[PDB]
Write a protein that binds this ligand. Sequence first.
Ligand code: SF4
Ligand code: SF4
Length: 81
Amino acid sequence: ALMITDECINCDGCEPECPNGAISQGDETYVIEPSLCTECVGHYETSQCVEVCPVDCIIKDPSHEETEDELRAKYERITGE
Ligand code: SF4
Ligand code: SF4
C-alpha cells in the first residue's frame, strides 16, 4: 500500500482518482486506508493518486509492504470475482 505524507497540501485531487475509495480527508492531510489500497493493481498500470499529486507526497508505506500478488489478491477481494 501507499501512504500520504505530512507534505500533503489538501488539494483534494487524489480522492476521486482512487478506484477503490481508499482516500479520504484526514485531520491535517488526506489519508490512505491501506486495506483498500491495491497500489491500483488490477485497475491501472500505475498508481492514479501518484499521477495527480502536485507535491509528490504519496509514497510506499513501509508498514504495509505488499507484493504484486498480494495487491492483486486485495483487488480481487474488493471488486469480487
Ligand atoms: S495507489 Fe491506487 S488504490 Fe492506492 S490510494 Fe492511490 S489510487 Fe487508491
Ligand atoms: S493529491 Fe497529493 S497534495 Fe493533493 S490531497 Fe492528495 S496527497 Fe494531498
